[PDB]
Write a protein that binds this ligand. Sequence first.
Ligand SMILES: NC(=O)c1ccc[n+]([C@@H]2O[C@H](COP(=O)([O-])OP(=O)(O)OC[C@H]3O[C@@H](n4cnc5c(N)ncnc54)[C@H](O)[C@@H]3O)[C@@H](O)[C@H]2O)c1
Lengths: 258, 258
Amino acid sequence: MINILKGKRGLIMGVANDHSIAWGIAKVLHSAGAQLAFSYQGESIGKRLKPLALTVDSDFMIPCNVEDPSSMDLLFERIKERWETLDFVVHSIAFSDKNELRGPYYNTSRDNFIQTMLVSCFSFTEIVRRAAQLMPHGGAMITLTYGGSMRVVPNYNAMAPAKSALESSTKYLACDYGGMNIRINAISAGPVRTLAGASISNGRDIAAWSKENSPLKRTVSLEDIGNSALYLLSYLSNGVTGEIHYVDCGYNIVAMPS
Amino acid sequence: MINILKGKRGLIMGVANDHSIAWGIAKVLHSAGAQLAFSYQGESIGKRLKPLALTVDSDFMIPCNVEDPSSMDLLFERIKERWETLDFVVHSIAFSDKNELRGPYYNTSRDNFIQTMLVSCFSFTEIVRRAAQLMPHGGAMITLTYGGSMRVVPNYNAMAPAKSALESSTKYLACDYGGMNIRINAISAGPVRTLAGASISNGRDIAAWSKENSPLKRTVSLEDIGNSALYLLSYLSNGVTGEIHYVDCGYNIVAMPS
Ligand SMILES: NC(=O)c1ccc[n+]([C@@H]2O[C@H](COP(=O)([O-])OP(=O)(O)OC[C@H]3O[C@@H](n4cnc5c(N)ncnc54)[C@H](O)[C@@H]3O)[C@@H](O)[C@H]2O)c1
């Protein structure tokens, strides 16, 4: 009963399996009428994406290494050879050495910090500025963040300044592109069940904690995020740019457990 | 007649001349009793620092390039050959390419971003880890930041996500080290007429705008920042850690001019 993206086409980055946030988003954005292009980071991923993409009417798949600006130049070159125009971009790329997401933050190595910054923060700047060039009549973009950027989440470590800066760049990008009628927002998702446990050593704990202590008593679903993304990428969110939108079943509001 | 820093020893990072924030801080800390060590970046800065440091009774000056791990190691070796233990650190170091502090944030290049991040953000993590080893009974450190991290200031560009990451790591460092009674805080200063300040285009306009529209209608002085540093580094702020403390004559609270 929703087709507000009828006739709109966009780019989805961040799919790694059927449990990826970018995938939940993809499903919901397609059900609302969007044509999807996808990027993929590796071969195993491409092989899982292929069937997934097919179930949302799409064979448009383009490998990309978000750490290499040439790769991204190429990603847009391949996109452009089918679409002269783009309406939205989903950026859900998060990487860090998972072995360094344990113990105290001060053990963050310089190279992991550089790499985590590059992939988890600056890639959005890169992509956004490439994509804008295909939005001559405006458009909308989102990145993904987590509340661990601003309050201390144990183990999160290197991810934390990276998101913090991602959130910062989100707001600067919004100001840059605002005159061109491009909107740039972020979704601060809560832990997603099962996904949490594979991303970081205490993921299960973080999630269980979040579900026990959120006002809504559940964790956010992939579909929740998909619908919030649908909101921020459609005309519905026309009065909204540069927003760090919290979609965590309200976990962020509670100061302590009951 | 203050002397709450009687018998304390501290590291001052970031003096470049007699207008530097770290210098204002050094002056008020010294006048409250503290013995001071200084790190300087280059030879001209060193030549300018010798006479100054002399006026606060110090010849304890060590070179240090903060994008060089070896050099920060050497810095702390040179400290230890005189002091086995240390009471406080001031981290007042920033860098970004003058050329990129102009125009839209999206023109920020990858290399300037990595470098700005290393020097402006991660160098604090670097320094904090080494210094902590010199505070077996606890102590206090501060870094410097600016409200441009979280609200958009024209031309501030790459400095913004860098400061944001810096504010993030401050809180994370505060959690890693609170068990050791080491407090880690930051000062968010209003505009001050400095050497690195003149890298930003239209910083003059920025400072005039911030002065005109602040509740107090004045700019912060090196002494204001020095005094808030004295607070943040002594027994006075014993209940304060992880705090981003605004010392900007209240600019941040005003939503629009009157
Ligand atoms: N200038 C302002 O108005 C202002 C506003 C609030 C916050 N801040 C912050 O204050 C601090 C900057 O000092 P400042 O503004 O008094 O100007 P400044 O230029 O006098 O001092 C900046 C220092 O950063 C140092 N630095 C740069 N690269 C270095 C390296 N590789 N190794 C060691 N040192 C290096 C410089 O040597 C210099 O001493 C920064 O954290 C800055 O972001 C500045």
